[PDB]
Amino acid sequence: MVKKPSLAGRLKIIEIDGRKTLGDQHGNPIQLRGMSTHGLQWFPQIINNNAFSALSKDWEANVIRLAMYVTDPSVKEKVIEGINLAIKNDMYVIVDWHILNPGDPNAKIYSGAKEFFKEIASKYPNDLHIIYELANEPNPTESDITNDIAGWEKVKKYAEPIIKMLRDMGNENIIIVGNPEWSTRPDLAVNDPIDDKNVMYSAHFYTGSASVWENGNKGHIARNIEKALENGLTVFVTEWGTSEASGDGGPYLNEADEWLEFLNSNNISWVNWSLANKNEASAAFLPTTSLDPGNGKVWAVNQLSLSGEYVRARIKGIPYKPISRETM
Ligand SMILES: [Cl-]
């Protein structure tokens, strides 16, 4: 079982024998393993105590990510309750300003980020539970976040005012910064890293659309991860799926094995997409499964999709022995 906030305390980047990694208050390496909500506008019913209790207790998650797409400003309320439910259920919590369309974390439509982050931070001053993720997936869709240094620099100009502000009020939280091409470029930050001892860099992958190795070569995403790591950055996988990059297809579980070996061997924390019951391969729950499992109840394994079942075993760290899906 991966360590809970009750035993890990404040997370910080530590260095051991020349290598940086995510560590706890005691100065030991730690790995976070959990689940991301789907968009909190589309799937807010996951923000319930019985669900968060089940993920923490049964799935043995030490983290949950609250994907707030940027609909209504009322979505902000489900984030607050989610933060509350996570603290109360002994889990780290990623507050994800979930940019996607447009792709630019700056571009007009994302005005209130610093403002939003200010609010959450004020409500929970230097709370050990919270991890701030400033921009889910900077990307080229309706934006000039290009797949290069110039694109990384726009992301950096967006992130720094928010980081400084957070640090000024005494917030020593892990901050995770996204990067170009849907957060597949943590290597771009090597060129010009954020001067903050507790900033990490996102990487995202979908195992049906990305392999660790192909035709003898390290794949693009895995090698971009390696480049950031070799150059003294740390990487946190705030979103990966067992499906294709659409969120559907497969699941691709043999490829997931290889990704997870690669991440565990490098002590890279990871959060699986997603806690939906949408009819898509990446969704952890069957379409007929309620996102509230009931009072004192967990979801049964047969209420979980093939992906959900697989990720649950991996979060727990138990061998994966899939159930029979036919009975007569
Ligand atoms: Cl196994």
Numbering used by the authors: 50 to 119, 126 to 383
Task: Show me the paper's own sentences about this structure.
In this study, a new thermotolerant and exceptionally halostable GH5 cellulase from an Icelandic Thermoanaerobacterium hot spring isolate was identified and characterized. Thus, we conclude that CelDZ1 is a novel endo-glucanase for soluble cellulose. CelDZ1 has an (β/α)8-barrel structure with two additional β-hairpins, one at its N terminus and another preceding helix α6. All of the catalytic residues are conserved with Glu192 and Glu294 found on the C termini of the barrel strands β4 and β7, which are the acid/base and the nucleophile for catalysis, respectively.
The CelDZ1α structure has been determined and refined to an R-cryst/R-free of 19.3/23.4% for all data to 1.9 Å without σ cutoff. The N-terminal 49 amino acids forming the transmembrane helix and a linker to the catalytic domain were not defined due to disorder in the crystal. Out of the four monomers that make up the asymmetric unit of the enzymes crystal only two monomers, A and B, were clearly defined in the electron density since they are more restricted by many crystal contacts. The other two monomers, C and D, form fewer crystal contacts and are less well ordered. The CelDZ1 model also contained 585 ordered water molecules and several ordered isopropanol, ethylene glycol and polyethylene glycol molecules that were present in the crystal cryoprotectant. Although the asymmetric unit of CelDZ1 crystal contains four monomers, these do not form oligomers in the crystal according to PISA. The residues Pro157, Pro306 and Ser329 are in the cis conformation in CelDZ1. Whilst both the CelK and Cel5A enzymes have the distinct 2 subsite, where the residues Gln180 and His206 (Cel5A numbering) form H-bonds to the oxygens of the glucose unit at this position, neither of these residues are conserved in CelDZ1 where Thr239/Ala265 replaces the equivalent Gln/His residues. The two residues of CelDZ1 are unable to form a sugar-binding subsite and there are no apparent nearby residues capable of binding a sugar unit. CelDZ1 thus appears to be the first cellulose structure lacking the sugar-binding 2 subsite.
